[PDB]
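The freezer alarm interrupted the setup, so I double-checked each line after restarting. Inputs confirmed:
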Amino acid sequence: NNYDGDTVTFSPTGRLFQVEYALEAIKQGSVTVGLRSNTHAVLVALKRNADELSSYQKKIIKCDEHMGLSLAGLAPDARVLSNYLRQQCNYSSLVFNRKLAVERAGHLLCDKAQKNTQSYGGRPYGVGLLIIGYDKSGAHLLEFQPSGNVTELYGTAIGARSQGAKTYLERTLDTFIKIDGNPDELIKAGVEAISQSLRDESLTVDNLSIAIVGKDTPFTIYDGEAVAKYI
Amino acid sequence: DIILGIRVQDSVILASSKAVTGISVDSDDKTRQLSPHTLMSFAGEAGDTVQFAEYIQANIQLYSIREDYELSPQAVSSFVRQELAKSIRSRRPYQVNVLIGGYDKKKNKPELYQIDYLGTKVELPYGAHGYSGFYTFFLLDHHYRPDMTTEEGLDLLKLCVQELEKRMKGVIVKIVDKDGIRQVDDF
Amino acid sequence: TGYDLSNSVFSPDGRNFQVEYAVKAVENGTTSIGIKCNDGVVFAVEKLITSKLLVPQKNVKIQVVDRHIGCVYSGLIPDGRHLVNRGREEAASFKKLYKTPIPIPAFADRLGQYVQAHTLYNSVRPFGVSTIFGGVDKNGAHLYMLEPSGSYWGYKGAATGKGRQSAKAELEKLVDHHPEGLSAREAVKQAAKIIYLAHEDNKEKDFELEISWCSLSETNGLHKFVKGDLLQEAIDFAQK
Amino acid sequence: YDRHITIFSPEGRLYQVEYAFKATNQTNINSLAVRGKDCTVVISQKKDKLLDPTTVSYIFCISRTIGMVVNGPIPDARNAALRAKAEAAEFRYKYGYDMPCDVLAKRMANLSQIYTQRAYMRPLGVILTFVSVDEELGPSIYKTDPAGYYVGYKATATGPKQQEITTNLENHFKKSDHINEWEKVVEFAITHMIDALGTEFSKNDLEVGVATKDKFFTLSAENIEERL
Amino acid sequence: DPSSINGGIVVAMTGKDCVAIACDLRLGSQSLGVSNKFEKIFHYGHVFLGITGLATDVTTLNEMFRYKTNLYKLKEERAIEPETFTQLVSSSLYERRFGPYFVGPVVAGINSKSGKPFIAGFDLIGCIDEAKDFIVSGTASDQLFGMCESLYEPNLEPEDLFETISQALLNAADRDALSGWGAVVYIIKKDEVVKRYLKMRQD
Amino acid sequence: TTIVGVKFNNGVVIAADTRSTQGPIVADKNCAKLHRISPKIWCAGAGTAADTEAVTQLIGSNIELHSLYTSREPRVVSALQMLKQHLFKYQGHIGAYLIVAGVDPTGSHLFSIHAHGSTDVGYYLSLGSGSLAAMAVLESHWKQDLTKEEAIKLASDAIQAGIWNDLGSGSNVDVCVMEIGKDAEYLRNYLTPNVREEKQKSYKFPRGTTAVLKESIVNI
Amino acid sequence: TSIMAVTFKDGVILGADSRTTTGAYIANRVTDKLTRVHDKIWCCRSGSAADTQAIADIVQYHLELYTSQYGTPSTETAASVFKELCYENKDNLTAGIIVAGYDDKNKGEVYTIPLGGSVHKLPYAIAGSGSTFIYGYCDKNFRENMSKEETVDFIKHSLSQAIKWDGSSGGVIRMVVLTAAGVERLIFYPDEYEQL
Amino acid sequence: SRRYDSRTTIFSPEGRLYQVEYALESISHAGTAIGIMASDGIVLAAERKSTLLEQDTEKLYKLNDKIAVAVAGLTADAEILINTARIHAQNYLKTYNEDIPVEILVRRLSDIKQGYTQHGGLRPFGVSFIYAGYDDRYGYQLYTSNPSGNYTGWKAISVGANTSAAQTLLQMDYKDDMKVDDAIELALKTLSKTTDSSALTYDRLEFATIRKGANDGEVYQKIFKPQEIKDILVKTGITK
Amino acid sequence: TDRYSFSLTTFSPSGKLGQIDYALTAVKQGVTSLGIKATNGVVIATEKKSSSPLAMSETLSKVSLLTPDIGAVYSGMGPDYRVLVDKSRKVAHTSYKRIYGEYPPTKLLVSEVAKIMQEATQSGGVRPFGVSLLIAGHDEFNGFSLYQVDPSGSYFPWKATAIGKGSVAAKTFLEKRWNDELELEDAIHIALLTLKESVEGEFNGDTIELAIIGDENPDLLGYTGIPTDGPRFRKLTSQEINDRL
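Predicted 3D structure, all chains:
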């Protein structure tokens, strides 16, 4: 393949192979699930560790009091994108006394990702993101790919073997859609969904991370003993 | 600020006031040995003088290391004059006046140069900066001889220093000759 | 042979293969159509419902420039968004300089120059989108289509994407059967029908229809989405 | 290789310039320019029911007095048209009098030569024909190519079928320069194109640009039919 | 006024087939004499330049013009003539139109090919003053004008030109407090240049 | 200084005085104030002499390059525009007040330019410290249709009025005439009405009167 | 300086005096203060001559580029182009401009850009040092939908009074008429308007 | 544009710089230049590479009043470096009010040459210089500098097409107590013996000497005219 | 965007700069041009070829005035020569005349042109000029001069020379007819005879361009009044060429 050298080269069929390789980098990451109802939004993440003597890699990053995300793929790219999102939310608050909408943040991430796939000297990002938030329009969940595509969904999953969780979410859509005012039930639904992507491991207090945002709930992260009641 | 210099047949004698300007008790030396046979004395605005003198000394030492050779006093004076002329056009000019004493080994002769903050260089048998000239030039004009020895030059300098002390404490006296640079301790 | 590995390299026959590959990328997108009526323009687009988990009526595709220009595109969606952002900057600069909304042909020329500038160097990649845009200005209604090579033209009816052939045939029949022209609402209904017919090529996935229009007698010369009872009437007419 | 950028081949050639010359014939349209000793006339051969015909044109109005016709792809054509308009406006601002046709042609040719000499710039695959009635030289036709070469002409033709038109023009001039007649010159050029190519050009098959002493304009389809 | 800080005067006159340029020797700070051996006249081949004004600017311009004349000789393989050196001085001065050198340069020479004596003067921003009789500059410019308009004659032998220019210089310098601690005169012919030091009242 | 410009039936004539001073002291008794921008385009400048000379030289060099580039003779309007924009860029800090006249393929032209960049078009113009007397003469005697001889006489009379009545103007008169189909005619010292009379005696000193300390030979 | 522009039934008419002063001396008896920037868009200039001339040159250049790219600019567009230069450079320029234009749809239009760089659309505008003396008379005499002769008479009377009372204005009265029939120039000499 | 980069400043697996070696090979095909230093002067002799056209008004150049150079290689690159060296000498004179020592100027030129070898992406200068100068430190000095940026001091040196043969000839018949005339004879004999031509005529030679006196002061540089070269050839014994 | 910061002209392993050699080949494929130096002038000549019979060949001139006393001709690529002439005129004005008030001598202007041409063989992302130039001039202190400048920036002074397709034959002919005593008319006649051999088509005043550096021409100086003010460079009209034929 002579067309995969850089990001400014089309293939004869019209494919960008560096973007596809970044997507492949995503597909080898740990599974993360995002879910929402009319009042709350939830992220569930399965961590990974190098070995037993190692700690587990963090997967959930807080962007603002009403917004956060979980990552799958190359972690430093997630850090870069999260810092950019934090700066944008801070700018909105400082200049307009306004809470940045989730859709606008998705647009900003799409625009920032597009510029890295059209000019020489820069590679596309190597991470996929699930973004949850609560704003004046309610709860929102977004999925971001490094090709620049951003989609708004009721629920989704990314990473290795996420198809089972996605099928579970698609089957039980009408159930978790209407879990309003009961955050624990939504968290348990998300945990059950992420249980569908496990093959040779079980959820423990060391490898499970949860995040929640809602109508009266700021973006909060639970890990360790704080998730012991959801296992 | 007393900065004075007298060039006699085989050497150059420089004198600089050992006073500062407050409240403290020290013995300030306003000279920098640019090279084993070239000395520079300075006067002027505080801060600028030390910085300029150290800059010149560093550049001359760098040249001496690079070429393994000692610049003549004339070349040193020309370099200093160029630096001052550049400074006078800059955003923050140096308010420094200098006397440069040297003993050219090639020509085997002493040389004395006087440069002001503007960049005016003059080679003189004797020179001064500040108000030393106004109270010293009568004696220098009456008594100077180009063929004076080191002792006669020292005596004339002593008379000049006493005249300065009449209309005011102490001076530091440096001698540059074929053996290099030394400081007079009996003065 | 080796002339296809860099942008802005002429082939022996006088071709730029990277632009043709960008056209190939455009041909893999969804179907976008534009229709020019008696006093305005109508834009319609098909959105594939890949998963039922997508929130309906969200993920808007049709975009607005200034308050009178509508734009839709087929190909790599992020490239289309980049182009629309550039067009918004151009319109803002024109409005600031000359205190008047930018005429549609001028906007088309600015977009065309920007697209063309990306075929001049090998350090950049051509845009992989074909864009149908238009609106209303003091001279009337204008509809344009722009290709990855930077070439653009004005059209009575334009179509792009995977189902472009059937859409073009339907548009040609529509133009032939209505020499006088069409009204805005009739154009909305016809756009719904044509999008539904063009989707019949791809029956593997369900689709959602999105329609916008800019008319002098219906929107007072502004660009507005179709969301109310008119959208349902158009959908019923298309499915009939 | 030497065939990808603008560097010399071992034979002293520049392959990218030759390939741009090849690209100039992507559109199968011919254009003809003639002088009438008081005007200049250019005629082009514009050839889908969905298109708006009034928006299709390869004739540009660079300034009040200078007109341009392009042979080649329309994106590079519009690039060159915008550049020429900017150059003419800057010339008028800087020097206080209207830019002449030959000087504009020389400036565009210099830009083309820059493209042929710099690696990162590719040549534009277009041929540019500037027409005017200069206040110092009378009717004027000048032409520039992707190689950076420009010259003035008594008459000229561009396109794939340009040899026949050139031969017919040369025979007419040998019979006998310029045309001794703007409408008559337009009809002469239309008849020349018809004889050179064939068939009967309708009002939709051509576009006409006319440059008179203080103006350059383009005829509508109704005017072209009136000529017919 | 920077031009009246150091003092000094320069005169130039034309002879039959000869030229003469004279200067004072004083260098003082404000009213204290610093040096009586400060010459204001330099030569680059057979072209002579005398500069009055700030001593630093005089030295700087001398060094710069030596630089430029050496490079000109290297490139052209011939010495520069007074007429071209005048244009060079004018351009060098006008390149500092807003941060100007406070100088009073005067050019005197003999053209090698033609043999005609040439003389010119400049202001601080490079305006050229061409004269067939004389050029003056310095703090005693008015005194020099008065002496020259009375003593000068259109054609003088170098022996008479020496006396004329010397008397003009001495009598103009004796009426200027900032000028006069010695005086130098240059008499320039086609094939010989003579330099003479005059005796003066000093004070 | 006094500078004037006058149009006539087939061309334009400019004229100027020849005195340049630094305050009350005459620095140059015979100075050239008519500058050649191009062979048929001439400018007369007042104000700062160095500024006038340098600006005319620069604009002339640019005009020559432009004429070579365009293969056409220079036009007066081009020089006017270039001078105007250069002067406006410096916001009056370049002290040049110009009368620019010429003949080009479009005809004969006369313009005035001020140090701030403003330009004026007129049949007769005056500038300088003596411009009031010259303008008085011009308003007294200018006519709509003038021959070359009459225009030369009128311009010379205006310069003479400036010479007589204005302290900053005097010495000689320099003229330049440009006609549509002819070469430019530059008349240096067209009139010299200030010739110094003979002195009462000769002040040539006898040889040996000046005391000398030392003498030497200088190697050039 | 006394400049004005008046809209009337068939179009617009600009009028001005012709005196330029450098204090007490009249440096130019015959000045043209009516500057064309486009075929039927003109301006009256007051203030610093250099600033107004440079601004008019730049505006003419920009409008030529606009015409080559986009078509015939409107009077409002020309006023906006003037306004950008006046407002963004108001700390270095002194220019009071009256922009008058004609088009088939809007007929004649007048915009005023005083010092500072604000734009005001008016049925008629007056500016200059001599304007102050005719603020009343014009306000008492202006009508709308006047014929060409009435507009000429109104401008002539107003400018004659302004010339009479203002020492910085005088000379001849210049007028430019913009209508569908095109552009017309008119001039009136002191022996004509001083008898009014 | 990464494909078209030739990487002119990289090492080889053997630790060599390809461009420097290729420039040396290019120089090895240029006209021979020879410098000989005697106890009282320096002789520079270069062989042109010829027709019957203008010669009096390409290989010998003057840097200042005391330093001259002989060029082997590309003439225009050599002119660039010579202009830089002249400016450097004038700058040193301006700063220190003294003539620049030969070694300082040679080292500056060598550093300029080395910079192109280490950083940047430009080709090195294909020029070798033979410097002949005088200063108060060491007296008469002869140097050579190559595209590698190395400079060396020589009693007798040759650069060009026949460096090996010329150097072998110069190793013998050279003494530390030779005079200027003996040096001139030796240089002419070496040029005649190493010349690949029928005869060593005056129209294919350039000559220069640096000595004391000859209607000058301390040091005089003489660039021989063609007539002077012919007279010298007759006197030495070449008679060609 | 422009990442071509590296030289496109590099040394081959044999020590040859390939791009300069290819530019020389392009020059050698060009039409013939000649220069002949006389005791009282210099002649520069070239053939005028028309791309099309309908083209007004008068609008294109292969001989260009650089300064009133210096002109030039070329063999090779036309547009490169046009740009080089523009640059040479600008450098003549901005490097010499604005400093000394006089036009530069022929040799210094040739050196500046050579510097410009050399910079195109070492700077990054640039193709060398594919032309060879013959420059004829006169200056007060050196007389009349003729120079040849190559694509590599090497320049040489010539009594007579030729460049282009028929370079070798013309050089041999000029060598056989050099005597160090020619006048301007003799040089013009020799140039016409040498051009008649190398021209295959019609040989008249419309297919030849001739220029001369001779004596001052007060007629080509549109003003009078300054005794020290002449344009030695002169281009012969087609009628004069026909008369001399």
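Quick read of the result. Helices of chain A lie at 17-27, 75-96, 102-114, 163-171, 173-177, 183-194.
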